[PDB]
Amino acid sequence: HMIKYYNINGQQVPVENATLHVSDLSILRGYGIFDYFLAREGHPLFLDDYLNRFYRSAAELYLEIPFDKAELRRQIYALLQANEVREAGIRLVLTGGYSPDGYTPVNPNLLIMMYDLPASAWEFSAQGIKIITHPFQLPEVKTINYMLKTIKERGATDLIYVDQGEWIRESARSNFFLVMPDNTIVTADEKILWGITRRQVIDAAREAGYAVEERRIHITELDQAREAFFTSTIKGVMAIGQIDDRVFGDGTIGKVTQELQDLFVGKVKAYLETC
């Protein structure tokens, strides 16, 4: 509840002293990567899958994480014990690091931060969320270091993109799924390698005997689906009740979406049992 400590570069630091010098490249240029996952019953969920994503994110930016995976795993568990929590949100950050010339990475900085479990985590509400579609369309100016994060609500809480006015494109925040009248589930394949919750839910759906097609989604498919939902670390499986002017069902969670919520909780229990 009270979080006492974070970790910077392997050292446990009181939250009140956790600071970086302003030469850090994430401060100066926004150069950095992150990951985020929950812990329950004293164990980070699907931890190996998250750590694998973190090492891959780092590689995409040519940043070397200063510890190997087993060492990072150890640091995370140590931090949970130092903060005395069994339920938490954990954020990993790897910055571009301190640079003598304000541009050259010479040593990334590694942060492990810890939070309460998000109050809304896996809310699993019966009432679906309302989102908009938006064109995928600053025209590349060096002065703006900042994922877009500038929506302005627009009676909605979230959105999905439309590209070339014909293809659905997922935001960075969540993976997007449709359930068709025939119980075919459809999702993009573009973030196949990157979605952790996405894979657990696809696996569960397949085990339940649903077909899951992974392909580009045409805008017109939104008019043909019975259900729509999001997956992410914090949401779990989250019903979407309305897109623009389209209500799905009566706006409440659909049959397959609900079953996938239960099966996701099942995948969480099964993981926890191996721990």
101 marked among binding-site residues: no
Which of a second copy, Mg ion, none does residue 181 bind to, with CB < 5 to 8 Å depending on kind?
none
**DSSP class of 182:** T
Per residue in 99-135, is it b (16+ CB within 10 Å) or e — as a string? beeeeebeebbbbbbbeebeeebbebeeebbbbbbbe
* Separation of alpha carbons 149 and 15, rounded Å: 26
Indicate the residue whose CB is closest to Mg ion. 32
Q: Which of residues 171-210 bind a second copy (CB under 8 A)?
A: 171-173, 190-191, 194
252 marked among binding-site residues: yes
Q: Which stretch binds Mg ion (CB under 5 A): 19-27, 73-81, 227-235, 258-266?
A: 19-27
Which of a second copy, Mg ion, none does residue 173 bind to, with CB < 5 to 8 Å depending on kind?
a second copy
CA dihedral 74, 89, 7, 270 (to 10 degrees): 0
* Separation of alpha carbons 76 and 188, rounded Å: 32
- Give yes or no for residue 23 binding Mg ion (CB under 5 A): no
- Give yes or no for residue 26 binding a second copy (CB under 8 A): yes
Q: Which of 40, 44, 57, 238 binds a second copy (CB under 8 A)?
A: 57
Q: Give the distance from CA 223 to its chain's centroid.
A: 27
Which of Mg ion, a second copy, none does residue 147 bind to, with CB < 5 to 8 Å depending on kind?
a second copy
Give min distance, CB of 15 to a second copy, in A.
Answer: 9
139 or 209: whose CB is closer to a second copy?
139
144-152 contacts at long range (C-beta below 8 A, 24 or more positions apart): 145/29, 145/30, 146/30, 147/171, 147/172, 147/173, 148/172
| Contact set with Mg ion (CB under 5 A) | 26, 32, 95, 145
